[PDB]
Amino acid sequence: QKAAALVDLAEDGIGLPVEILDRYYFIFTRLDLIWSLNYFALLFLNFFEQPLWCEKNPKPSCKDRDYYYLGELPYLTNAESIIYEVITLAILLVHTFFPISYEGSRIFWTSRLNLVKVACVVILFVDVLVDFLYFRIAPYVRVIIFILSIRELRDTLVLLSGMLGTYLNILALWMLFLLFASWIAFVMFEDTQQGLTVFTSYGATLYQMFILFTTSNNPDVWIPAYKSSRWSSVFFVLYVLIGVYFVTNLILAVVYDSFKEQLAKQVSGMDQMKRRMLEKAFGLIDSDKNGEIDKNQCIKLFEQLTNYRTLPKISKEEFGLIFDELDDTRDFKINKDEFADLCQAIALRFQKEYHSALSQQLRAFVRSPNFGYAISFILIINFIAVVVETTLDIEESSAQKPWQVAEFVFGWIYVLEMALKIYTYGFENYWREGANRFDFLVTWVIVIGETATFITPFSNGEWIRYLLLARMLRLIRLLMNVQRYRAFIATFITLIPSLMPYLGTIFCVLCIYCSIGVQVFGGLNKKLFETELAEDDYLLFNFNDYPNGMVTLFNLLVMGNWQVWMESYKDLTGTWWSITYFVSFYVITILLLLNLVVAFVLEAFFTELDLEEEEK
Amino acid sequence: QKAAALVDLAEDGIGLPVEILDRYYFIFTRLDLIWSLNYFALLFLNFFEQPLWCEKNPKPSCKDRDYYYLGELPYLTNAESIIYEVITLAILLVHTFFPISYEGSRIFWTSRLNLVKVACVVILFVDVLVDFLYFRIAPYVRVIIFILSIRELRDTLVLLSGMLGTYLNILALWMLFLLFASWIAFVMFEDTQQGLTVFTSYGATLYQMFILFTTSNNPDVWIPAYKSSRWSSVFFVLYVLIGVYFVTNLILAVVYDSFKEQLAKQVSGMDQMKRRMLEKAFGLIDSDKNGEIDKNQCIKLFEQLTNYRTLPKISKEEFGLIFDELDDTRDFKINKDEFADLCQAIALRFQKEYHSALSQQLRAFVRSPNFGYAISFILIINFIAVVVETTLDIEESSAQKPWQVAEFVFGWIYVLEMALKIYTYGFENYWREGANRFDFLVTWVIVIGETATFITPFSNGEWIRYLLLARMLRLIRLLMNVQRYRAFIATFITLIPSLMPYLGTIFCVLCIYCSIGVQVFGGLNKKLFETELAEDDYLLFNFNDYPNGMVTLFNLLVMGNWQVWMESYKDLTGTWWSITYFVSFYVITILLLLNLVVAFVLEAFFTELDLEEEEK
Ligand SMILES: [Ba+2]
Ligand SMILES: [Ba+2]
Ligand SMILES: [Ba+2]
Ligand SMILES: [Ba+2]
Ligand SMILES: [Ba+2]
Ligand SMILES: [Ba+2]
Ligand SMILES: [Ba+2]
Ligand SMILES: [Ba+2]
Ligand SMILES: [Ba+2]
Ligand SMILES: [Ba+2]
Ligand SMILES: [Ba+2]
Ligand SMILES: [Ba+2]
Ligand SMILES: [Ba+2]
Ligand SMILES: [Ba+2]
Ligand SMILES: [Ca+2]
Ligand SMILES: [Ca+2]
Ligand SMILES: [Ca+2]
Ligand SMILES: [Ca+2]
């Protein structure tokens, strides 16, 4: 009946899942709940197509492919590129044809998102056939399509814009600070030592003061001036003090507040949609369209929410006397708004979510705490076994087999545990809790490890087995029982998945800034390449290939000696208008995104503290 | 009368100033309000006695004093040390004898603070006479005496302890993280490349992973492992990601919350004392000790608070009808608690604080906005004049006199402004607003500059004049009229004095960590000193002298290539138990104090936003 349809709607809205219509929509979404899973791997592989792709560097140039400090394995032949791109674009084409099913023809192409999706698809197609028969913006539309493909990154982008609004203003003020400070600094050391300051007039001093602002060149950049006079330092310290602890911090504060504001905006935009779900449910169960529901119409919805969703109580005549007790007046009173708060309160404060003989013997013992204690002690002896095997491999006193085979059969004990636990709990019930999913993937990489190690053909054993000691990382959850380190560990655990859309966003930003590196900074040998610098002759073993560009972009992201990539390339291309790359990168990923994730970590920790204080 | 005494008490308690008694106390505190000013300069000079003092390095050793990359001017002869220390200790002795006057004999020596003060004094004495007739902990008791000398740093220390409590716990968890990560990393690269990892077994890997945790060696420390295999990076990035953005951030969060808590505790401890002041006032004006005050006893206190403190209204029979209106019932009703809220509300929402012919002509025109506009335009043309003089000095096309003499007479216009403004407003009224004090000190360094430049005897002109263009920094206050950059600038302005006790605290911490450097790391030439490192042969132009040790401590504080001081000294002394210095420093001044000031900047900015939102 319509009532049951409601129960599904209320339970789904409670689970925060929802559609966007108003039985085609139903059955089509049901067809989507499986296709989305393959679509995820599709998007991830299509994204990984970009780093595995060939480059524009070996393209009509000599003499590829050798090792002029450029490249790491592997690459892609143009044919494999063709077929792979064709496959991914085909499944993607299906993934773009599919949402038109549970939508109107004039409705689908009307949304700002879908038309952009299709546009990126036809761009990727008009580029895949051309790239086949024959390449610039081709990798860009891949990461672009990917970012908007997943809503949990789309919302993040909306957020980021919503704060970049004022972030531009605080950036302008920062720019003013830089300009003035650089001017005063330049006019301070004009007709004295040294040459590194005066070398390229004012612009050089602005450049170097900007690099001093990130403190990635602090001891050195004013070292000659300090050698001249010691009191010179009194300037620079004052510049750092006022620069890093005063300015940068309140920049972080600006990004903080802006983020919090836009986030409150986002969840405010979420509650409205959820309310739309609940009001849809009530609107459907209210056949008379009076705006209210009666007990003879309410206890059935309650009963359905009991039988199909959560567990409250039992409905009898006692229930009738209960409804007759709340007012000693009748009948009956529940409206469109009280119903929502009732559903929310029930879903919140109350509970949530073959022969029955041979299986029920284990289905009652696996739910017992004895099983958890079993796998606990198992991962303990697993720990001591692993640390022994490893501590004997480092002493080369092996005697490696009797322990590593034991860790293999430990992996077998883990796949046994995983199998019986995924069997006794459920197909989707075991998949709901994320920890069990982590254990699921760890196990399912352990077994493909077993296929790769035992079936077809040592050191590979040590490698592909010791890495999966992260299965024993769940033993650290024990520390939450201590009121000293509870909030910390809990915050971390809740941070692992919640910080993921931001990390993924900035990762995609890196994947966007890498294509720029391949397209512009292809050429790395030469006279310039060997001239400067010292460790830069070692540090520049990258940014020529794509994974190299990615990991050196990481090296920029940690701000560890980052400027050595900025300057060594500056005099590698010749033009100063190359550094505009680096700066931009910084000002996009250091003063914005990293401050954002700092803000989010802080806010998450405070939320955890407020939760622990709430339950007190 | 007693009532007037109250008015002074309520006004002082409102101004947050207070004593600690219960007319000796009165007159003695009045004698203190002037002595404290000299005591400040006394404490500052006594503190500056430490960096100007001699060292333990030239003490019975050869061959001082040359330039073996050790030392900057100036120093102190032992005789000058004797007389200076004697003077400072004498005035300090007076400053310790003085508080015993307005206190009880059995009361003074009973307080935990005073006895420690006197103890430090007699230590400084039993050390000054010995150091005279002849030196280890002598500089320590100076900074120690100084920190507790000023309450505004004492409270900061209390705060710091109150948070270091749990900060120890989060530090322990961090230690665990380091240990485990270092172990797994070490066992990852055991029987492969390279040597930098295995060199000193596990401890070396813990050391290097710890230096990777501060990201001050990120590209390099795993560079050989990356040269071996590219996939090795996949480890380290995961270590940095999980290390810097997950751990360090919630460490900052811990310090944040702890700080906020202890601060709320502190201001809570402040309001209690203020309430004690107000309750003292009411308790004194309530002669009958009934706990309440009548209108015929209240309008006189009101009248006194009008005539001597702030400005409300006028008291007539209309006032009597007003009191007869609030209830149409009498008489009369004000108790000990309502009086406090009344005083607070009046002091908050309402206002706050020779022939009268020749002077009153200027005393009415200086208060006009035309004067502010005058000095504004004056500092504008001052700006263009200064930028012209400076931009012609850098072109060596001078023609320097006609502009620099104009900036001198500009300084004269500023001392004229300062004189007439300090004359027309008041002796202490001009001193209340901090901005006018900044202008006062700028002016009063400009005039001693005039004494040093014009009276006794160029480039010295340029130097000692261009530096005081910070008098034109008040032109940046104009930006607050823009609703884009208002909160930022305002926050900064309010941060300049409020962040000062923390900066002073960490500065004193540096001054404590410097004596350790002089006493332990005296010896810097040698074989070790020239061996490592490259830029470290240039970077180690310090930490031998005291100001050198201070500025290189600054170089450590900014975490710019800090580890090069840590390692170069490690193999300069030989023992690893020297690095325990550096680490400690870090873990005291980077994970605690700097996170504290970050938290404080953020909190200040948020407070500013809440204020601007409040007035909306
Ligand atoms: Ba010059
Ligand atoms: Ba000059
Ligand atoms: Ba250089
Ligand atoms: Ba930082
Ligand atoms: Ba109605
Ligand atoms: Ba459970
Ligand atoms: Ba619990
Ligand atoms: Ba170097
Ligand atoms: Ba080995
Ligand atoms: Ba091995
Ligand atoms: Ba090395
Ligand atoms: Ba009473
Ligand atoms: Ba005023
Ligand atoms: Ba105003
Ligand atoms: Ca292709
Ligand atoms: Ca109805
Ligand atoms: Ca002395
Ligand atoms: Ca009374």
- The CA distance from B522 to the nearest CA of chain A, in Å, is 19
Please indicate if any CB of chain B lies within 8 Å of the CB of A504: no
Q: B488 and A250 in contact by Cβ < 8 A?
A: yes
Task: Find the CB nearest A187 among B223, B390, B606.
Answer: B390
Q: What is the 3-state secondary structure (H, E, C) of B103-130?
A: CCHHHHCCCHHHHHHHHHHHHHHHHHHH
| H/E run at residue A482 | none
Q: B169 and A485 in contact by Cβ < 8 A?
A: yes
Break-preceding residues in chain A (C–N over 2.5 Å) = 22, 134, 353, 457, 524
Orientation angle between helical segments A486-498 and B151-188, nearest 10 degrees: 60
Sort residue A289 into left (φ over 0), alpha (ψ -120 to 50) or beta.
left
For B555-564, b where at least 16 C-beta lie within 10 A, e where not — what string? bbbbbbbbbb
Q: Could you tell me the two tokens for A280?
A: 């849809």
Q: B396 and A187 in contact by Cβ < 8 A?
A: no
Helix locations, A429-527, DSSP H: 429-432, 434-450, 459-466, 486-498, 500-520
CATH architecture designation of domain B369-481: Up-down Bundle (1.20)
Sort residue A560 into left (φ over 0), alpha (ψ -120 to 50) or beta.
beta
| Among the listed residues A476, A487, A384, A398, the one whose alpha carbon sits nearest the alpha carbon of residue A438 | A476
- CA B86/CA B88 separation, integer angstroms: 6
SS3 assignment, position A357: coil
Orientation angle between helical segments B579-588 and B563-573, nearest 10 degrees: 150
Cβ atoms of B255 and B163 within 8 Å: the answer is yes
How many Cβ atoms are within 10 Å of B98's Cβ, its own excluded?
16
Task: Please count the residues of chain A.
Answer: 616
How many Cβ atoms are within 10 Å of A196's Cβ, its own excluded?
17
Q: Which residues pair with B292 in a beta bridge?
A: B335
Cα distances from A309 to residues A14, A197, A275, B146, in angstroms, run: 11, 72, 19, 68
Orientation angle between helical segments A2-14 and A249-285, nearest 10 degrees: 170
For B480-485, the CB contacts below 8 A with 24+ separation are B484/A166, B484/A169, B485/A169, B485/A172, B485/A173
Expressed in angstroms and rounded, the spacing between residue A463 Cα and the centre of ligand 10 is: 8
Q: Any residues with CB less than 8 A from the CB of B213 and at least 6 apart, and which?
A: B178, B243, B244, B248
φ/ψ (deg, to 5) at A334: -150, 125
Helix locations, B134-200, DSSP H: 140-149, 151-188, 195-198
A369-476: CATH topology: Four Helix Bundle (Hemerythrin (Met), subunit A) (1.20.120)
Expressed in angstroms and rounded, the spacing between residue A72 Cα and the centre of ligand 13 is: 68
Q: Which residue of A has its CA nearest to B551?
A: A233
Interface of A with B in 339-368 (CB under 8 A): none
Which chain A residues are within 8 Å of B554, Cβ to Cβ?
233, 237, 240
Q: Which residue of A has its CA nearest to B251?
A: A488
Please indicate if any CB of chain A lies within 8 Å of the CB of B26: no
Instruction: Verify cis geometry, omega within 30 degrees of 0, for the bond prior to B65.
Output: yes
| Among the listed residues A499, A616, A417, the one whose alpha carbon sits nearest the alpha carbon of residue B247 | A499
SS3 assignment, position A334: strand
What type of residue is A604?
A
Q: B215 and A609 in contact by Cβ < 8 A?
A: no
Q: A215 and B534 in contact by Cβ < 8 A?
A: no
**Given resolution (angstroms):** 3.3
Q: Could you tell me the two tokens for A7?
A: 């129960």
- DSSP letter string over A123-155? HHHHHHHHHHH---STTHHHHHHHHHHSHHHHH
DSSP state of A76: -
| Among the listed residues A596, A504, A600, the one whose alpha carbon sits nearest the alpha carbon of residue A150 | A504
DSSP state of A109: T
Torsion of CA A44, A45, A50, A54, to 10 degrees: 170
Please indicate if any CB of chain B lies within 8 Å of the CB of A194: no
Half-sphere exposure at residue B400, Cβ-oriented, CA atoms within 13 angstroms: 17
Experimental technique used to determine this entry: X-ray
Q: Could you tell me the two tokens for B500?
A: 């000062």
Q: A555 and B218 in contact by Cβ < 8 A?
A: yes
- CA A606/CA A602 separation, integer angstroms: 6
Please indicate if any CB of chain A lies within 8 Å of the CB of B249: yes
- CA A20/CA A25 separation, integer angstroms: 9
| Among the listed residues B336, B236, B232, the one whose alpha carbon sits nearest the alpha carbon of residue B277 | B336
Sort residue B53 into left (φ over 0), alpha (ψ -120 to 50) or beta.
beta
Q: Which residue of B has its CA nearest to A534?
A: B534
Q: A554 and B394 in contact by Cβ < 8 A?
A: no
Task: Please count the residues of chain B.
Answer: 616
- DSSP letter string over A382-401? HHHHHHHHHHHHTTT----H
Q: Could you tell me the two tokens for A31?
A: 């067809």
Cα distances from B438 to residues A426, A564, B383, B489, B547, in angstroms, run: 73, 41, 18, 17, 26
Cβ atoms of B542 and B552 within 8 Å: the answer is yes
Cβ atoms of A168 and A140 within 8 Å: the answer is no
Expressed in angstroms and rounded, the spacing between residue B85 Cα and the centre of ligand 17 is: 6
- CA A227/CA B19 separation, integer angstroms: 50
For chain A, first and last CA: distance in Å? 43
A266: exposed, middle or buried (C-beta count within 10 Å: 0-12, 13-18, 19+)? Answer: middle
Token pair 């900015």 is found at B605
Expressed in angstroms and rounded, the spacing between residue A399 Cα and the centre of ligand 9 is: 15
φ/ψ (deg, to 5) at B182: -65, -35
Q: Could you tell me the two tokens for B581?
A: 């210095």
Q: Any residues with CB less than 8 A from the CB of A78 and at least 6 apart, and which?
A: A54, A131, A132
How many Cβ atoms are within 10 Å of A289's Cβ, its own excluded?
7
- CA B61/CA B240 separation, integer angstroms: 46
Task: Find the CB nearest A605 among B220, B253, B548.
Answer: B253
Q: Which residue of B has its CA nearest to A503?
A: B241
Cα distances from A162 to residues A154, A411, A556, A587, A595, in angstroms, run: 12, 47, 26, 17, 15
Expressed in angstroms and rounded, the spacing between residue B302 Cα and the centre of ligand 18 is: 15
Cβ atoms of A503 and A539 within 8 Å: the answer is no
Q: Could you tell me the two tokens for A56?
A: 């524009």
Task: Find the CB nearest B551 among A72, A233, A396.
Answer: A233
Q: B551 and A220 in contact by Cβ < 8 A?
A: no
Token pair 């900025």 is found at A566
- CA B342/CA B163 separation, integer angstroms: 36
- CA B132/CA A242 separation, integer angstroms: 41
The distance of Cα A27 from the centroid of its chain, to the nearest Å, equals: 31
Q: Give me the residues near ligand 9 (ion), CB cutoff below 5 Å.
A: B 190-191
Domain ranges within chain A, ordered by starting residue: 15-149, 369-476, 494-614
φ/ψ (deg, to 5) at B53: -65, 165
- DSSP letter string over A157-179? HHHHHHHHHHHHHHHHHHHHHHH
B268: exposed, middle or buried (C-beta count within 10 Å: 0-12, 13-18, 19+)? Answer: exposed
Please indicate if any CB of chain A lies within 8 Å of the CB of B164: no
| Among the listed residues B445, B388, B390, the one whose alpha carbon sits nearest the alpha carbon of residue B418 | B445
SS3 assignment, position B487: helix
- CA B448/CA B408 separation, integer angstroms: 12
Q: Any residues with CB less than 8 A from the CB of A367 and at least 6 apart, and which?
A: A424
Interface of B with A in 37-96 (CB under 8 A): 72-73
How many Cβ atoms are within 10 Å of B521's Cβ, its own excluded?
18
Q: Any residues with CB less than 8 A from the CB of B358 and at least 6 apart, and which?
A: none
Q: B560 and A215 in contact by Cβ < 8 A?
A: yes
SS3 assignment, position A103: coil
- CA A185/CA A181 separation, integer angstroms: 6
Cβ atoms of B308 and B13 within 8 Å: the answer is no
Q: B244 and A558 in contact by Cβ < 8 A?
A: yes
For chain B, helix, strand, coil in percent to 5 are 75, 0, 25
